[PDB]
Amino acid sequence: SSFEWFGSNESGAEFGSGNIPGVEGTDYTFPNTTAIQILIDAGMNIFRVPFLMERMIPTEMTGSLDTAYFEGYSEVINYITGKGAHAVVDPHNFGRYYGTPISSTSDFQTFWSTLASQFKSNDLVIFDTNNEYHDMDESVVVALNQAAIDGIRDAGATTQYIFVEGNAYSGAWTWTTYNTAMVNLTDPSDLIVYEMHQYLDSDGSGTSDQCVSSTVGQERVVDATTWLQSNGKLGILGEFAGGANSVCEEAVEGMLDYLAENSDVWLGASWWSAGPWWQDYIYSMEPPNGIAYESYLPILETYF
Ligand SMILES: *[C@@H]1O[C@H](CO)[C@@H](O[C@@H]2O[C@H](CO)[C@@H](O)[C@H](O)[C@H]2NC(C)=O)[C@H](O)[C@H]1NC(C)=O
Numbered sequence: 001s002s003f004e005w006f007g008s009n010e011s012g013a014e015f016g017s018g019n020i021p022g023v024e025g026t027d028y029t030f031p032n033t034t035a036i037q038i039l040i041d042a043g044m045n046i047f048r049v050p051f052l053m054e055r056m057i058p059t060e061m062t063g064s065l066d067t068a069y070f071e072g073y074s075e076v077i078n079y080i081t082g083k084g085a086h087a088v089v090d091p092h093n094f095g096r097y098y099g100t101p102i103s104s105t106s107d108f109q110t111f112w113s114t115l116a117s118q119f120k121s122n123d124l125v126i127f128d129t130n131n132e133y134h135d136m137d138e139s140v141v142v143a144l145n146q147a148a149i150d151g152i153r154d155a156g157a158t159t160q161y162i163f164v165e166g167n168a169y170s171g172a173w174t175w176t177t178y179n180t181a182m183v184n185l186t187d188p189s190d191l192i193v194y195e196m197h198q199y200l201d202s203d204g205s206g207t208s209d210q211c212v213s214s215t216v217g218q219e220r221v222v223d224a225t226t227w228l229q230s231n232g233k234l235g236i237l238g239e240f241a242g243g244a245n246s247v248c249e250e251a252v253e254g255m256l257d258y259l260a261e262n263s264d265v266w267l268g269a270s271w272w273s274a275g276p277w278w279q280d281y282i283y284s285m286e287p288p289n290g291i292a293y294e295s296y297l298p299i300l301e302t303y304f
Pocket of ligand 1: 032033034035276287288
């Protein structure tokens with residue numbers, strides 16, 4: 001292999017974000033375990049599974065677990081890890097709860113204790129503090145990541161890796177601009193990995209199948225790599241995608257090339273995304289039909 005990890009996001013349980021709590025099979029759905037097996041069969045060994053905070057612990061983030069939503073969610077997590085792959089537990093929330101930016105470190109830490117308690121003995125679980133903090137003050141974002149860490153560990157979830165995420169959608173290309181204060185994160189178990197996202201379209205939003213250039217991928221992860229090398233941190237590219245065309249594919253190959261050459265900071269990547277409701281989606285990695293599945297899986301498998 002080139003990386004310690006390589007996998008895909010498995011979306012569905014976070015869809016219908018406009019509808020809280022929402023109803024399974026209408027607003028949202030869970031990932032298909034059979035389809036995950038196919039990607040395991042192909043050589044993928046880590047799976048990031050988004051979910052909404054408000055659906056997991058309704059009303060208040062110090063509250064109790066929704067039994068139904070948590071069992072739909074855990075069934076997928078226990079399938080991934082029961083097959084010996086890592087499962088990334090991902091509250092897909094942008095640093096906001098019911099749309100308000102999160103500003104209580106003690107409440108966020110209570111949220112994470114409650115959640116991380118239900119997974120404390122599954123070493124294959126990874127905890128992801130929050131998906132893409134944005135438009136919040138840097139200090140608050142940093143403290144929230146430290147709150148999550150504290151609630152995870154104090155819940156006894158002490159062997160699992162913790163993916164922490166930066167401000168500014170935790171993009172790699174803006175990391176040294178917004179997220180230099182994220183060095184000051186500690187963890188008693190010392191298993192912090194910095195999870196960065198990188199898309200290759202003009203604004204980096206990853207909503208287009210067009211890339212800026214066949215070198216834009218590596219160009220957008222060089223700064224972030226020297227920050228990890230300099231300050232002695234580990235990184236994982238938690239989301240990345242390209243359109244099904246040659247220029248994009250060249251840019252993903254050149255970025256992954258660069259990351260794999262720097263294996264000593266970069267532990268791997270995860271594609272955005274797989275999951276059973278993507279259909280026509282320009283980045284769908286979901287078998288048997290997904291546009292990325294046909295075009296990129298043959299490419300990415302070179303790095304497994
Ligand atoms: C989950 O994934 C499996 C594997 O892709 C899907 O099974 C396929 O289902 C369609 C028709 O329903 C068939 O064309 C394929 O032959 C099936 N492949 C199998 C069984 O390996 C299954 O439909 C998916 N379930 C969902 C999306 O709910």
